[PDB]
Amino acid sequence: DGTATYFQSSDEHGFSMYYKPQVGFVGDPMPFYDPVAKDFKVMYLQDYRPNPEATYHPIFGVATKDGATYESLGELISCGGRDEQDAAIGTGGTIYNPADKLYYTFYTGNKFKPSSDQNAQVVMVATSPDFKTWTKNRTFYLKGDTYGYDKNDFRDPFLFQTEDGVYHMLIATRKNGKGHIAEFTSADLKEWESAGTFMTMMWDRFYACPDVFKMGDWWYLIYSEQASFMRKVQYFKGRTLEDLKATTANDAGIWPDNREGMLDSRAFYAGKTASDGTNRYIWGWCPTRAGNDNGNVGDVEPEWAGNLVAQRLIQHEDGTLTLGVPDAIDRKYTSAQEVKVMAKDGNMIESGKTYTLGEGASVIFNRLKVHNKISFTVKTASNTDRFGISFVRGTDSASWYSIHVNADEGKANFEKDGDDAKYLFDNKFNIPADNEYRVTIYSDQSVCVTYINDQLSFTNRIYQMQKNPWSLCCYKGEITVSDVQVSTYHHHHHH
Ligand SMILES: OC[C@H]1O[C@@](CO)(OC[C@H]2O[C@@](CO)(OC[C@H]3O[C@@](CO)(OC[C@H]4O[C@](O)(CO)[C@@H](O)[C@@H]4O)[C@@H](O)[C@@H]3O)[C@@H](O)[C@@H]2O)[C@@H](O)[C@@H]1O
Ligand SMILES: [Zn+2]
Ligand SMILES: [Zn+2]
């Protein structure tokens, strides 16, 4: 704690709040509020590095009351045989049927090397009375082309029941080349009728992992954009279901806010929600990086799967959504640590427990631990200033990794700083009029989420942020840093 040199830390210690199974990684999650157990069941596609040919992504599960503590459920729905329709499983959705007291999980069966007459993707279902033993329904095969949709893109079923008792299933597919979310209705979850297109997908986009829900006086669609330049979780909103569906009708592009509904950036994907009646949370995954290299974020798309991340939905008075930390996660960080300056550079002053940094100045703080909570307040002199939050920055580090907050650009960027500096990706968010940024960062080994002013929610993979110093800097203008605090998970030091 008295040195600030770079240390080659690892993820082997283990994750807690941003869950990873002992073997493999967390792919698309399928969260569900279990109304009998009164907790969340998060099914997810289990990823291995490498996966088998043909038979991959079985559905595993974890249980959580709150998004911070997880109990593994192991393998719940296994892959089919190499030649079967669900040789590989894709994402779906779970729902409880009070009439027969069965949990139903609809999923995507991906056929290995389909023939011209076969369907690459078909929706299938499994049921369970207790969420431990699941029985595949060997007679249920929902094919898109039966209803005018696509034979090979027909996936990610989302199930919900409306107040009138009707069950709805939304499926991401195509019709005449264009992306369509198709709707099916049922009284009993067994016999399904097509209700046509729920919503079309903007332009040539494709909305994976759709999720529709009502929260307060607004209806929402949350989705994950497949297009390579986006790869982010986004949403639309409407006061009525018809208003929601109209946001994309005829490519209207009625964005819900001033940032095209982009909730997070490229290190949080496949996000879907569930509510316990008090809060609605969103679960997605944070990708791994090839070679554990924080600056290798994929040439086209990032690696698929990684760690499970939960965030809380914040509904604003105008109906827009931002994401915040789940309250139970904010409580895993218990012992406040001492914050000490280990190095200063450039044009800056230390004034007690505040710091003023001019253009080009940096301050480096003492080493973080393994699971961290970092909080501070930044006041900039102008609404065009720029400052940085840097990790893995040892006094001897040639390069490091930073969240750049660019007020003149209306966004935060994740970048590599120092030698071989390079921009990686960004995250638009509302800039405060009073130039005050209340920052909180929650980390679990290599996974962290940065929150600012209940407006920015920025997940990042930062290998080796643990057990290494962190830093604040000013790139443009002048900033004053206040109320710096750091709290930790491990804290069991008898003194
Ligand atoms: O080729 C197999 C090989 O590819 C990976 C990703 O590198 O898995 C992709 C395949 O998984 C499948 C079935 O499990 O889909 C899973 C779900 O993923 C979703 C959203 O995350 O989208 C699939 C979509 O992901 C891409 O990688 C995006 O470009 C596409 O390849 C693909 O269309 C969701 O919509 C799916 O349900 C299967 O469909 C994918 O091809 C590896 O893990 C795997 O080993
Ligand atoms: Zn401990
Ligand atoms: Zn630990």
Author numbering: 14 to 508
Paper text:
Here we introduce the first crystal structures of the B. thetaiotaomicron endo-levanase BT1760 (EC 3.2.1.65). As typical for GH32 family enzymes, the BT1760 comprises an N-terminal five-bladed β-propeller catalytic domain and a tightly packed C-terminal β-sandwich module linked to it through a short helix. The distance between the nucleophile Asp41 and the general acid/base Glu221 in the structure of BT1760 is 5.2 Å suggesting double displacement mechanism of the endo-levanase reaction with retention of the configuration of the anomeric carbon atom. For BT1760, respective amino acids are Asp41, Asp169 and Glu221.
The E221A mutant was proved catalytically inactive: its catalytic activity towards levan (measured according to the reducing sugar release) was reduced by about 4,000 fold compared to the wild-type enzyme. A native dataset to 1.90-Å resolution was collected from a crystal that was soaked overnight with levantetraose (L-FOS, FFFF), a levan degradation intermediate that can be further cleaved by the endo-levanase. The ligand-bound structure of BT1760 revealed four subsites for the binding of fructose residues. According to sugar-binding subsite designation as recommended by, three ‘minus’ subsites and one ‘plus’ subsite were specified in the active site. The nucleophile Asp41 is located just below the fructose residue bound at −1 subsite, ready to attack the anomeric carbon (C2). No rotameric changes but only minor side chain shifts (up to 0.5 Å) were detected in the binding pocket compared to the wild-type structure model, thus substrate binding likely does not induce any major conformational changes. Since this carboxylic moiety is missing in the E221A mutant, the neighbouring Gln239 was found in two alternate conformations partially filling the artificial void. The levantetraose-bound structure of BT1760 shows that the −1 subsite accommodates a fructose residue that lies almost parallel to the bottom of the pocket defining the deepest-located (designated by us as level 0) binding subsite for a fructose residue. The levantetraose-bound structure of the E221A mutant of BT1760 suggests that the levan chain should be bent into the active site cavity to enable endo-cleavage. As the strongest proof for that we detected no levantetraose bound to this module in the crystallized protein – the only ligand molecule was found bound to the active site pocket of the catalytically inactive mutant of BT1760.
